[PDB]
Design a protein around this ligand. Structure first.
Ligand SMILES: Nc1nc2c(ncn2[C@@H]2O[C@H](COP(=O)(O)OP(=O)(O)OP(=O)(O)O)[C@@H](O)[C@H]2O)c(=O)[nH]1
Ligand SMILES: CN[C@@H]1CCc2c(ccc(O)c2O)[C@H]1O
Lengths: 56, 283, 224, 335
């Protein structure tokens, strides 16, 4: 009952514990590299020409 | 020039405030789309009337009374008189309409939304304005109001004097149309509103007692200033024409001037809601 | 060509606007009110969401039920900040069987941030059976002393033992003691005595709602 | 035996927490300090949309950055055209109480579900007309999105999420494991994994194919009201009621940044990213909208002008404009 629900959770946590983890440095480096690489086509960040904007 | 020095600031002070108390109200109403409601259109019309009155008739009257010589044409002087009458008679029916709207809102709450709509407000405003105009341009452009005695004829013949001289009938028609009729309606409206407020307070007191100055103050601040400002003028206007040699020109013009300052107290009275004050604080 | 295409695009906007304008008056005319109560309070007999429509003297009311589920934490309350009035249905029959939970629920509702302005109407349903329970288990046995309570003379006993009237008055004042503190004048609570025998209770609802609207309008123009 | 299971749970939970802490080489703030700041950003309103009767609850942009749908409290869906600021459709509803909107990737179907335990689907191209309706939830819906043109994933208040099938109208995979109400969800660009934020201060990542939970996050302290997914596909940012926005990490399996200002104590109702992934736009209960910086946690612009609270947000597919939905029955298009 409650014991059964606990078993259901008891099994679940163990499964979510056997995973491979990567150092935060590599993830941060990848994130910043992607953000810097795709920072030249964002109209919000960089103002586009006035004639280009359909709303103008 | 001690008398001259003084009136100059005082006539000067009144002109700036009246436009100031009008342009601020109108720009606060126009700038924000929230302040607008059916109950704001009448206030907008009243503010516009006060603005045009204070921007047209006050400086001309001050110049006429200070210089003691009218240097413009007779036609322009007649136009000045007509526009003064128009503004004076249009700055009262708006208050009457506001009172009637409040009466309908309080006494009949369920049907208030259906009774008043954005389309009917424009019709009411146009009707009030045209009623005011029918007694300002139509009888003044023509010569229905002219007097008969020699002094009036001499003044109209000369191109240097502008003194209001009028036939007995006109005085009692214009006064009745402009002041006396829009008074009893407002008195009845406010009596009914006060009765309803007292009934509600008595109802709540019995229900939640163990576990009014506000209404009196609110009605006083609305009625007393208006009656004090516009009562003496609309009794002297009829007593001086029923019989002669009773009222001097000095007191007449003084009462006329004291009536003009009422248009500047409207922004400080009818715009005391916190939403109204928020716009003033922002700007 | 492009002019031709756009011109039709102009036509579509106009027809919809005419309908939105037509529907605006219908939306503004109706008055809506929520019905809320604890379990076994008799809300279902009185009446997932069950929207009921009725007309009283050319006044449109749209009564929107809330539904039934065990939800200690409620998050749909934010959706009901425009309700004209909230109907509360509570039963005094459960005093020995429990009202205290209903009182706690009422206290939680009254102090909610999203419901600061909306008033509450309370119905004391199941009051008919209270007489049998009171006269031949008593309230005085509980920690709140029914016996020590002094019966107010303001309440008029309708056509009649004093014990049942005193019990009804005490139970009624129990909710008002909670309600009056946090009201601050913005919103009030309307007590009422109701039962299934009462052939018409709408008249009472109409008189309460009209007074609520009148008081709100009076407070808006700085007259109260 | 329950006690034994609980002791085992502590032993595992403690093991995990230590495993997660062992991978914290350096905070993301520490590495990212030499990046040149974006600077102050000021945006002005371009278009204003009017025509609703009541407050607006949600909205969703189209796939061509042209049309957008929105649902109001009165129970009407209006499909606009921001280029010509004119209405196109007005769909009546069976129930007035609604909370959701969606738009198909093919621009052919629109779905909305509200307080009733019913999800409705309409066909825009054929007059407006109900195509299919889905039932089976015992709680109010909170958010629905089209995963494809043949199946929808929705989250209700029953602490459950399901992936419906349009042709049959019955659930094909049911997700369970939450404790409190589920409030929002978002779909990854590859339509493989989706996340959801419950009311138990816990955000979980699920699997569409297998149908089981994978990871759990517990960084917040109150309910979660909105969630967004990073363009890269390896991060997602949430929003809670304590005026805090947190950026987690799927690979590292812990949070990295928290955005909070000492001058605000309100809540958060809408969060969305930009195309470049540098700016994180969020809405508050303080009558306005704020713009953050993903990599520097520095405010770079305040968006104000709404009469009431903001309860919707959206960014076009090409990153050309951002729209906000408020309770003042007015939509605005910023740029
Ligand atoms: N003795 C008595 N019973 C009543 C009276 N009015 C209603 N009841 C009964 O009280 C019971 C409880 O009310 P219901 O209508 O069942 O309310 P409910 O089913 O709890 O309503 P929900 O909360 O919507 O589920 C019903 O069996 C009613 O018939 C009354 O005046 N006297
Ligand atoms: C010059 N000022 C005038 C003089 C008399 C008068 C006014 C307004 C309405 C009338 O019916 C009047 O008789 C005043 O505005």
């Amino acid at each position: 009952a409650s014991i059964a629900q606990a078993r259901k959770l008891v099994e679940q946590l163990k499964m979510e514990a056997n995973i491979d983890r990567i150092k935060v440095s590599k993830a941060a480096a990848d994130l910043m590299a992607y953000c810097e690489a795709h920072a030249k086509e964002d109209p919000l960040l960089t103002p586009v020409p006035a004639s280009e904007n359909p709303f103008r | 020039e001690v008398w001259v020095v003084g009136m100059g600031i005082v006539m000067s002070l009144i002109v700036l405030a009246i436009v100031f108390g009008n342009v601020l109200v109108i720009t606060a109403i126009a700038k924000f789309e929230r302040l607008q409601t059916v109950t704001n259109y009448f206030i907008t019309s009243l503010a516009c009337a006060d603005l045009v009155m204070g921007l047209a008739v006050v400086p001309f009257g001050a110049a006429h009374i200070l210089t003691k010589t009218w240097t413009f044409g007779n036609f322009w002087c007649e136009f000045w008189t007509s526009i003064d009458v128009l503004c004076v008679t249009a700055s009262i029916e708006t208050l009457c309409v506001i009172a009637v709207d409040r009466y309908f809102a309080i006494t009949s709450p369920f049907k208030y939304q259906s009774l008043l709509t954005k389309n009917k407000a424009r019709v009411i405003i146009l009707m009030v304005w045209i009623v005011s105009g029918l007694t300002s341009f139509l009888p003044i452009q023509m010569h229905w109001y002219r007097a008969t005695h020699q002094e009036a004829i001499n003044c109209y013949a000369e191109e240097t004097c502008c003194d209001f001289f009028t036939n007995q009938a006109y005085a009692i028609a214009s006064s009745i149309v402009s002041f006396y009729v829009p008074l009893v309606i407002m008195v009845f409206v406010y009596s009914r509103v006060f009765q309803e407020a007292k009934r509600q307070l008595q109802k709540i007191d019995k229900s939640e007692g163990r576990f009014e100055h506000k209404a009196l103050k609110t009605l006083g601040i609305i009625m007393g200033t208006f009656t004090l400002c516009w009562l003496p003028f609309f009794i002297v206007n009829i007593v001086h024409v029923i019989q002669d040699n009773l009222i001097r020109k000095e007191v007449y013009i003084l009462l006329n001037w004291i009536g003009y300052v009422n248009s500047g107290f409207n922004p400080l009275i009818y715009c005391r809601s916190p939403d109204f004050r928020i716009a003033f604080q922002e700007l | 060509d492009q002019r031709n295409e756009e011109k039709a695009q102009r036509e579509a906007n106009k027809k919809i606007e005419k309908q939105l304008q037509k529907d605006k008056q219908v939306y503004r005319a109706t008055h809506r009110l929520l019905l809320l109560g604890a379990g076994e309070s008799g809300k279902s007999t009185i009446v997932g969401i069950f929207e009921t429509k009725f007309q009283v003297d050319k006044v449109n009311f749209h009564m929107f039920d809330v539904g039934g589920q065990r939800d200690e934490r409620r998050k749909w309350i934010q959706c009901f900040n425009d309700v004209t009035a909230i109907i509360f249905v509570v039963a005094s029959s459960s005093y020995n069987m429990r009202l205290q939970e209903a009182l706690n629920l009422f206290k939680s509702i009254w102090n909610n941030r999203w419901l600061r302005t909306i008033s509450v109407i309370l119905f004391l349903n199941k009051q008919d059976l209270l007489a049998e329970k009171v006269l031949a288990s008593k309230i005085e046995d509980y920690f709140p002393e029914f016996a020590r309570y002094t019966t107010p003379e303001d309440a008029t006993p309708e056509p009649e033992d004093p014990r049942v009237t005193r019990a009804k008055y005490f139970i009624r004042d129990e909710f008002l003691r909670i309600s009056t503190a946090s009201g601050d004048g913005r919103h009030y609570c309307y007590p009422h005595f109701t039962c299934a025998v009462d052939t018409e209770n709408i008249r009472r609802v109409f008189n309460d709602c009209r007074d609520i609207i009148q008081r709100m309008h009076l407070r808006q123009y700085e007259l109260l | 035996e329950l006690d034994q299971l609980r002791q085992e749970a502590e032993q595992l939970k403690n093991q995990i927490r230590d495993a997660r802490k062992a991978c914290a080489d350096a905070t993301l703030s520490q590495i990212t300090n030499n990046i040149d700041p974006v600077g102050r950003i000021q945006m002005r309103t371009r278009r204003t949309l009017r025509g609703h009767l009541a407050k607006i609850y949600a909205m969703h942009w189209g796939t061509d950055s042209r049309l957008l749908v929105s649902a109001s409290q009165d129970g009407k869906l209006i499909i606009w055209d921001s280029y010509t600021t004119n209405k196109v459709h007005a769909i009546p509803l069976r129930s007035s109480w609604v909370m959701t909107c969606a738009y198909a990737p093919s621009g052919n179907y629109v779905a909305c579900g509200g307080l009733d335990n019913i999800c409705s689907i309409y066909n825009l191209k054929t007059n407006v007309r109900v195509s299919r309706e889905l039932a089976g939830h015992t709680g109010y819906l909170s958010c629905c999105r089209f995963l494809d043109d043949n199946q929808i994933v929705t989250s209700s208040g029953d602490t459950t999420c399901a992936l419906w099938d349009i042709e049959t109208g019955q659930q094909t995979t049911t997700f369970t494991g939450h404790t409190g109400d589920v409030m929002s969800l978002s779909l990854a660009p590859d339509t493989r994994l989706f996340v959801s934020g419950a009311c138990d201060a816990s955000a979980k990542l699920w699997d569409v194919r297998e149908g089981m939970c994978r990871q759990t996050f517990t960084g917040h302290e109150s309910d979660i009201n909105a969630i967004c997914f990073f363009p890269n596909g390896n991060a997602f940012a949430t929003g809670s009621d304590d005026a805090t926005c947190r950026l987690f990490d799927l690979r590292a399996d812990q949070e990295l940044m928290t955005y909070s200002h000492d001058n605000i104590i309100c809540g958060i109702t809408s969060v969305s990213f930009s195309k470049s992934g540098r700016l994180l736009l969020a809405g508050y209960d303080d009558f306005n909208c704020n713009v953050w910086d993903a990599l520097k946690a520095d405010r770079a612009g305040v968006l104000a002008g709404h009469d009431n609270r903001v309860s919707c947000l959206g960014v076009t597919d090409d990153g050309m404009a951002v729209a906000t939905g408020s309770w003042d029955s007015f939509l605005k298009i910023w740029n």
